[PDB]
Structures are given as C-alpha cells and as structure tokens.
Amino acid sequence: RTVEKTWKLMDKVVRLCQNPKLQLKNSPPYILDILPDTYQHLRLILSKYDDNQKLAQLSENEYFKIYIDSLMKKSKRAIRLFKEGKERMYEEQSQDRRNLTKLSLIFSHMLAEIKAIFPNGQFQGDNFRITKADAAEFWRKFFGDKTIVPWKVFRQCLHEVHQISSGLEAMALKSTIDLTCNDYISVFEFDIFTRLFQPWGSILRNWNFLAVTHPGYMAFLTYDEVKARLQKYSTKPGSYIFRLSCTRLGQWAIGYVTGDGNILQTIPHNKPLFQALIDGSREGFYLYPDGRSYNPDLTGLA
Amino acid sequence: LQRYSSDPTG
Ligand SMILES: [Cl-]
Ligand SMILES: [Cl-]
Ligand code: NA
C-alpha cells in the first residue's frame, strides 16, 4: 500500500504549490501538472495490476520499489523545504525556491522515466531499447535486462571500459547521470546520458569537454532559468549556455543572446552538440559561454 | 517561432 502514503505526500506538495503567492509559471517543468500526472500514471499502473497476484508481483518489482521510495523521499523533501523556508518560498530568487525548481525538475524526469518503464501502466523496463548501439551493447554485457542498477556497480562496470580519473570525477559523473537523484542509474537515465554525450567511444572525454570543464554547461536548469540568466548578458550578443532539454529528454537546449537582444533557445537534432557549438561559434551566435570571454575550442572532438 | 526555435546557422 505504500503507494497511498506517496499520493498523500504528493497531494500536500501540490496543495502547497497551489498557493498563488508563489506566482508559479505554467512552463515545463510545472509542478502542478507533474505531480497530478504522476498520481494519474500511478493510478494507471494499479489499475493494470488489477488483482492480488499482480499486486504481489508489483510489490516485488525492484524498479517500482525504488521509484515509490524515491517519490516518498522527494515528496517528504519538498514538504521539508516549505516548513524550513516559510516566507523565503515566496521570494522568486531565494535558495529555498531554487531548491523547489530543482525538485520540480527531478519530478519531471521521474515522471517521464515511469512512462518509459511502465508505458500504459504495464512494466516493460526489461524490454527498454537503448537508443545508441554501442551504449546498448555495454548495458547488455554488464547488466543484461536490468531496469536499474546501483551507482557503485554502474561506476565499477563503466570504469572497466572508460576509465574514471578520480573520486571527484566520479562524483561529477554521478551528478550528471543520476537525473532522478536517487543514487541509482536506470536504463532510461543511461539512455539519456549516452544520447547527450555521444559517441560512446569517447564518451567521458565528450562529457569532460562539454560539461566538466565547459563554462556554458548548466546542470538542472529550466527554460525559464536559462532565459533569466542570459538576460544579464543581453548587451553581449553571442552569450550562450546549454543544458538538457526537459520536454525532449536525451537532447540539448542551447540558449543564446541574438544580435537584437532576444534570448532564443534551440535544440540540435541530427548535429551532435559539439558541431552545433563549433558551427554557432564560427557564425557569431555562440561566442561567450555564460557571458565569459574564453570559449573552449571543441574542434578536437571531431 | 514557438518555445524552441530553429538552428541559427541553418
Ligand atoms: Cl526492476
Ligand atoms: Cl540539426
Ligand atoms: Na537515478
């Protein structure tokens, strides 16, 4: 029954994020759509598992156990936020509030993950098809049909193929791949990471140069946050930053200041991120990452 | 244009 206490905690978060003092923007990730849509897909799951055996098998499904826990954990966390923050949660620019945006981002990724792992409410994690063949092979060789793996084990296996240089690189990596922030990597999270920092063959070097050392890279930011941040640099066209698309997981969203002072965001589709950044740089659109002068040379990744 | 726009380089 732990799914019932999870809904109560979620309902509270929603009820609590409905407080119109927040002036929340209907813009993905929008918590007032995400949490009820999550309860709904959870409804859809319980209804597809319609008798006691099916409910028993579900209760033993490892991914689902981790999911419901995470979701309790995270729902508890958002409640804790509002209790500790109180007044600060009405301040657009408080850290308590940024924390809530982060959590909204986490719920959005969790929502999309459950719709990929339980499409229509039926479990198909063991048949999730990884998008890239090299990454696919790798998940296969080490984890077969698992839907979800603990970080440490993921890390140990990854390291046998693509070596991690140090502890803090491992931590920066975890933080990049563990989008749901539950200290596990699902096949879905892995699909996303391997799409973002393709090709598989040079994957950690791609991440190193596109994320770990790149000033333009923004972790856990929204569309609205990108726009507000580049607003500071609107007198310096060519200012840009990039991040994970929230509504098109596995792809990047590039935000830039145009010559006329507009903030546009664009999503590469065929072109991998590095070519998009080389192409943009050379035509004057992507010159100043996060408003800064030094723009990393990415030509070596071709 | 919408929320996300076209590649500026073409
Ligand atoms: Cl599982
Ligand atoms: Cl393209
Ligand atoms: Na995770």
CA distances from A194 to A130, A160, A249 (A): 9, 17, 11
Q: Helix, strand, coil: what percent of chain A each, to 5?
A: 60, 10, 30
CA distance B6 to chain A (A): 6
List residues forming the annotated binding site of A for Ca(2+). Answer: 178, 180, 182, 184, 189
Q: What SS3 state is found at B9?
A: coil
Helices (H) and strands (E) counted in chain B, each on its own, are 0, 0
Domain shared by A202 and A219, yes or no:
no
Q: What SS3 state is found at A112?
A: helix
Q: CA–CA separation, A19 vs A23, rounded Å?
A: 8
| Tokens linked to A276 | 């998009």
Domain shared by A67 and A48, yes or no:
yes
Domain shared by A105 and A195, yes or no:
no
**With the CA atoms of A169, A138, A45 and A114 taken in that order, what torsion angle do they form, in degrees rounded to the nearest 10?**
30
Q: CA–CA separation, A139 vs A141, rounded Å?
A: 6
- Other C-beta atoms within 10 Å of A200: how many? 17
Question: Assign residue A184 a region: left if phi > 0, alpha if psi is -120 to 50, beta otherwise?
Answer: beta
Q: CA–CA separation, A274 vs A197, rounded Å?
A: 9
Q: Can you tell me which residue has the tokens 């923007």?
A: A25
| Tokens linked to A22 | 């927040």
Could you tell me if A266 lies within 8 Å of chain B, comparing CB atoms? yes
Which residues from A are below 8 Å from B2, CB to CB? none
| Gyration radius from chain B CA atoms | 7
Contact A253, A242 (CB under 8 A): yes
Domain shared by A12 and A129, yes or no:
no
* Partner-chain residue, chosen from A256, A265, A279, that has the shortest CB–CB distance to B4: A265
Q: Quick check: bond before A289 cis, omega within 30?
A: no
Contact A170, A164 (CB under 8 A): yes
State which H helix or E strand residue B2 sits in: none
Name the closest ligand to CA A276: 2
Half-sphere exposure of residue A298, counting CA atoms within 13 Å on the CB side? 25
State which H helix or E strand residue A287 sits in: none
| Tokens linked to A38 | 């999550």
What CATH number should be reported for the domain holding residue A39? 1.20.930.20
Beta strand A252-257 with A239-244 is antiparallel
Q: Which of A124, A151, A176 is the last residue of a domain?
A: A124
A105 CB contacts (<8 Å, ≥6 apart)?
A: A29, A220, A222, A246
| Tokens linked to A165 | 């240089």
Could you tell me if B6 lies within 8 Å of chain A, comparing CB atoms? yes
Domain shared by A103 and A157, yes or no:
no
Q: How many CB pairs under 8 A join A and B?
A: 28
Residue A6, judged by CB atoms within 10 A of its CB (0-12, 13-18, 19+), counts as: buried
Q: Which of A169, A197, A213 is the last residue of a domain?
A: A213
A41 CB contacts (<8 Å, ≥6 apart)?
A: A111, A114, A115, A118, A121
CA distance A74 to chain B (A): 29
Which of the 8 DSSP states describes residue A21?
G
Q: What SS3 state is found at A122?
A: coil
Mutate to test the interface with A, among B1, B4, B5 (most CBs of A within 10 A): B4
Domain shared by A114 and A233, yes or no:
no
| Method used to determine the 3D structure | X-ray
Which residues from B are below 8 Å from A266, CB to CB? 4-8
CA distances from A189 to A56, A120, A179 (A): 26, 19, 7
| Gyration radius from chain A CA atoms | 20
Interface list for A 83-102 with B (CB within 8 A)? none
Q: CA–CA separation, A68 vs A226, rounded Å?
A: 31
CB contact under 8 A, B7 and A256: no
List residues forming the annotated binding site of A for 4-O-phospho-L-tyrosine. Answer: 243
Specify the length of chain B in residues. 10
Nearest to A2 by CA among A51, A47, A55: A55
Q: What is the DSSP string of A231-276?
A: GGGTTSTTEEEEEE-SSSTTSEEEEEE-TTS-EEEE--SSS-HHHH
Domain shared by A174 and A256, yes or no:
no
Could you tell me if A264 lies within 8 Å of chain B, comparing CB atoms? yes
Q: Which of A213, A231, A258 is the last residue of a domain?
A: A213
Q: Domain containing A45: what range?
A: 1-124
Q: Identify each DSSP E strand in chain A by its residue range.
A: 148-150, 184-186, 239-244, 252-257, 263-266, 288-289
What CATH number should be reported for the domain holding residue A277? 3.30.505.10
The count of domains in chain A is: 3
Which residues from A are below 8 Å from B5, CB to CB? 264-266
Residue type, A87: E
